């Protein structure tokens, strides 16, 4: 009977707890001792851990499906509920201590939140079909698609909040959600489709048009193929051979040559991203090291990009169009984090998406033959298109930009919703969310090759147009030099949760968000802190003091 006790915890297992979904099966209800801090994680307080599943069933593919959850409820509780977002194609159940992203030591459980996580409705250990491209195989089941898109996060939010009410005898005062990439998509989905589920939302590098990522992948694959060298085991050009690491570093150094000082300070960071896009063209830019053109006049040298390379990358970066010339996704910003050198190690965080590792005999780019290309085929194309894994790269090379893009909007047979219907989160109708007090912090690294930061910026402009005064409840924080969710030559680490709570609960909007670099070696310094600035502002050096110190910077126009 006593609230927030071992006894209250074990009583959750099964029968006096009423779950919102009748098909909820608790498998674990265990009391956990406080855990000390480690070098990489903050101390976790004493808490109840509950795990189990919702809606166990058999899919039309004959496979088992269920929505797994793990919930942790501290004995000493700050009254707040927290859910972390997913990543990739989901399918795994995390420790559910409430990750807050941004490379942070603290978890939400370490801050005395009750924390929940889900696997999204499928299980990479079970829903792994060798004939349906592996752990993307859940896409063969219509309901599993719906669970991946929106239904799992809905079910698990409701289950968590009911358990919180039972365990503590009181409903959560506020609820918070934090996710990056696929978890960023989840957060935008929540603000649009379930506006009262969460009071504060952080959505980092959000895949809010994830079904179009494969379209961009086909495009970047085909755009880069002319500059490839060699073929793989099934005759596909080695896209990874199109640019060596030194070649990409050359390109980022040219970008810096053109763009670094456009914010007023030569420091290896392009804060003025808009001015950079208007000024930089690989075909007209100079290599700063030797005042010559970046594009070769003669044969290929180490200080030089070949004409086909420059053409390939310009076309990749422009984004896909169909035969009518219609943009299918968006363009991508030139930025210094496409490469970067720290010590003797070249940044791999940009090139792994479209190119893959140079020192390989096979293709391995996420968008050529990796999980992104596989996920489009099975998860987002309706009629799913399962095939052997060795055919995926060829399928991207043969992708038809008039025919195939239609498949993310199509229904067929028992696939009664399109992948844009269930996975997309493109709505700018956030009024219900704003008007109950909701706040949303978006962020995106500029050298993200999974999702275009410019496309997030375009969503935010549309939001601002649809909802005048939107900066009162939603702000976007672009991070120069940052790659996908983390890494790269930028200030990629930050505590988003503290400003989010301040906004929701005190009405204190973030006019800036402190950040620091996880690899300050990209700049040859020991540390670098900078403000992140709300769109469309950028960080501006005040003219004196340490260039690596955030206090000497302010947020302003470019
Ligand atoms: O299908 C894709 O293209 C794609 C899907 C999910 C992610 C993601 O969530 N990344 C997590 C890394 O933090 C990235 C790309
Ligand atoms: Ca600069």
Residue numbers in the entry: 43 to 56, 59 to 602
What's in the article?
The main chain conformation in the MHETase-MHETA complex structure is nearly identical to that of MHETase without substrate (RMSD 0.54 Å) and sheds light on the positioning of MHET for catalysis. While the catalytic triad and oxyanion hole residues are part of the α/β-hydrolase domain, substrate specificity is almost exclusively conferred by the lid domain. Hydrophobic contacts between the phenyl ring of MHETA and the α/β-hydrolase domain are restricted to primarily F495, and to a lesser extent G132 and A494. Strikingly, MHETA is tightly bound by the lid domain residues F415, L254 and W397 surrounding nearly the entire MHETA phenyl moiety. The two oxygens of the free carboxylate make contacts to R411, which is held in place by S416, S419 and the backbone amide of G258, which maintain a hydrogen bond network involving three water molecules. Despite their overall high similarity, a detailed comparison of MHETase structures in the absence and presence of the substrate reveals an induced-fit mechanism upon MHETA binding. In the ligand-free structure, F415 points away from the active site and thus opens it for substrate binding. The association of MHETA then triggers a near 180° rotation of the F415 side chain around χ1, closing the active site and consolidating the interaction. Our structural analysis suggests that R411 enforces a strictly required negative charge in the 4-position to the hydrolyzed ester bond, which clearly explains why diesters and diamides show no binding to MHETase. Thus, substrate recognition strongly relies on the aromatic ring as well as the carboxylate function of MHET both guiding its positioning for hydrolysis.
